[PDB]
Amino acid sequence: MDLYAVWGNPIAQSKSPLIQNKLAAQTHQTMEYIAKLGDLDAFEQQLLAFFEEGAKGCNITSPFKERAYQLADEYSQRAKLAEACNTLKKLDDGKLYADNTDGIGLVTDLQRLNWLRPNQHVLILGAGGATKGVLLPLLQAQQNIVLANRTFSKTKELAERFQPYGNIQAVSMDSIPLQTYDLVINATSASVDAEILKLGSAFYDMQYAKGTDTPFIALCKSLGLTNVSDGFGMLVAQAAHSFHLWRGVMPDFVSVYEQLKKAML
Numbered sequence: 215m216d217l218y219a220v221w222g223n224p225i226a227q228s229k230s231p232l233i234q235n236k237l238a239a240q241t242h243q244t245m246e247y248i249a250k251l252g253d254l255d256a257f258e259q260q261l262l263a264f265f266e267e268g269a270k271g272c273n274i275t276s277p278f279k280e281r282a283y284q285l286a287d288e289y290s291q292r293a294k295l296a297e298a299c300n301t302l303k304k305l306d307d308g309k310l311y312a313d314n315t316d317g318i319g320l321v322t323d324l325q326r327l328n329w330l331r332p333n334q335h336v337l338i339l340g341a342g343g344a345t346k347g348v349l350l351p352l353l354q355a356q357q358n359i360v361l362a363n364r365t366f367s368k369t370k371e372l373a374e375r376f377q378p379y380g381n382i383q384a385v386s387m388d389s390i391p392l393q394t395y396d397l398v399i400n401a402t403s404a405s406v407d408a409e410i411l412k413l414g415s416a417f418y419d420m421q422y423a424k425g426t427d428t429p430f431i432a433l434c435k436s437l438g439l440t441n442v443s444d445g446f447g448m449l450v451a452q453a454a455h456s457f458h459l460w461r462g463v464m465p466d467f468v469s470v471y472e473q474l475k476k477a478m479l
């Protein structure tokens with residue numbers, strides 16, 4: 215029985231196993247996906263033991279993304295840019311391959327929502343690892359990005375890092391250009407001028423509040439904004455992409471998302 219897992223701390227809350235099981239079912243892939251608690255200190259040793267004992271691959275969530283990336287033998291451009299990895303596959307030759315499907319998951323979910331038209335003007339709030347993990351595929355999807363963060367230096371580093379891949383402007387949080395943004399993405403854990411939010415056409419939170427509105431969506435809703443989404447689809451889509459890397463079959467993202475949402479509600 216092929217073994218996969220999600221590694222994190224905490225991990226008790228993870229939906230990854232539920233999602234991956236449905237993804238396996240849908241594609242009739244024979245495999246099992248479990249949740250693994252990564253020790254804050256021993257994670258590296260535990261992970262390697264996990265692969266030495268024969269696991270085929272795994273997802274990585276907080277706080278080990280960076281750390282997992284450093285462990286890999288080979289990695290994708292996506293992982294390289296993110297300098298972090300949410301997916302590992304132990305290749306047949308023994309190599310540990312890192313990828314980061316967070317960005318393509320985000321792209322895939324926005325496409326489901328029809329919120330990813332080429333040359334959209336997109337505001338992204340936050341410049342932590344989450345943003346860092348999605349910028350490359352967003353830029354590759356011809357999103358013109360205005361990036362703003364509480365801490366300006368990090369905004370500038372990211373704009374500098376991704377400048378070669380498309381249009382991204384770093385701005386101070388207190389000088390976000392007042393314009394209509396086709397899409398605003400919250401990638402904070404976390405203070406945007408409400409006047410900016412009010413002009414926005416669509417609002418996406420990478421955060422997913424199991425069974426409720428995230429702070430960001432609640433905020434948007436309090437300003438009378440209605441075209442909103444949390445990031446549950448992003449969670450399902452990144453999983454589907456990880457699955458595709460492992461299995462060589464692309465699960466039907468929309469179906470599983472729908473079932474999970476049905477499961478969900």
Ligand SMILES: Nc1ncnc2c1ncn2[C@@H]1O[C@H](COP(=O)(O)OP(=O)(O)O)[C@@H](O)[C@@H]1OP(=O)(O)O
Nearest residue numbers: 340341342343344345363364365368402403404405
């Ligand atoms: N109270 C707050 N207000 C604004 N942004 C906040 C916030 N708390 C967390 N964040 C943000 O959330 C991002 C980090 O979120 P996170 O705790 O989920 O980590 P990561 O993005 O690596 O997953 C950072 O952009 C950002 O602030 P700073 O770079 O200035 O630390």
